[PDB]
Amino acid sequence: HIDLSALNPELVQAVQHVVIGPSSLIVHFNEVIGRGHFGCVYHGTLLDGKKIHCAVKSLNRITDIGEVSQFLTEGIIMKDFSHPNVLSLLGICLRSEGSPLVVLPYMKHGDLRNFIRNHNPTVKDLIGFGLQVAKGMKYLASKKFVHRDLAARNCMLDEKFTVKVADFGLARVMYDKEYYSVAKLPVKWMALESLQTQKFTTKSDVWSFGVLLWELMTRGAPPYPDVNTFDITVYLLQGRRLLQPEYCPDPLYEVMLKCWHPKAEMRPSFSELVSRISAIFSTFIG
């Protein structure tokens, strides 16, 4: 029962250009994919009559203008992302009654963190996943887009094992709650300057990317498990970094240390990371 007239008109216009008519979408409400504090994800079918399997993102409540606007804004930020390693938007379904729905292509293997924690990807496969993230990030950084929450939990994996960089945003699943701490920030993925200023850049996405490579090489271990969330800045400032994983090649560990350079301006670009990781990947048989 949303009132579009009370929302930002430029936002509503943007939503209308990617609109999905309520009749083209079948939402299977009994087929829940995920549940969170602010939103839920269901299986869906989008209709030449060809059926497209999709994921349908909804808000739990439609009473707050700020939450509704943020929800639509999240969907709109995605509309022009067109890259094999970035999650795309199928459209937004505005209904007469209930939450607007953000429609995403269905990702067979779910999120990358759950995938690597579950299958037996080789070390080359895991490095390949990192290279795919770096390509998706090289594309976003070229559009001057700052992610702010790069982590394996925000990367999706389709049926061809193609990694799609994404952000659950308001559809954040309840199991992910421990990784965010008081605004709720993903402190164990954040760069030192961002922990101190709460300001984000492509260079702070690079720090997060190094943490994501560590997640990959450990097959989804939680980073800094013995550090209290509010003490991470003190821990890092003692002169510490995540340790080299057993199956992490030395050149890949060196790349991680470069991603965590204390000076943001000295961290490698995503363009350099794609180049460096392509080379390391190529050394493995498969």
Ligand SMILES: COc1cc2c(Oc3ccc(NC(=O)C4(C(=O)Nc5ccc(F)cc5)CC4)cc3F)ccnc2cc1OCCCN1CCOCC1
């Ligand atoms: C939780 O499980 C799943 C969630 C899925 C899904 O969820 C979302 C992901 C991202 C967004 N993002 C968004 O809503 C937004 C976004 O992504 N923006 C954005 C931001 C930055 C960027 F670079 C790109 C995109 C906020 C708009 C929204 C979603 F609803 C979308 C598609 N397929 C999914 C499949 C899932 O499991 C499949 C079943 C897996 N099983 C296999 C067998 O056993 C294991 C489990």
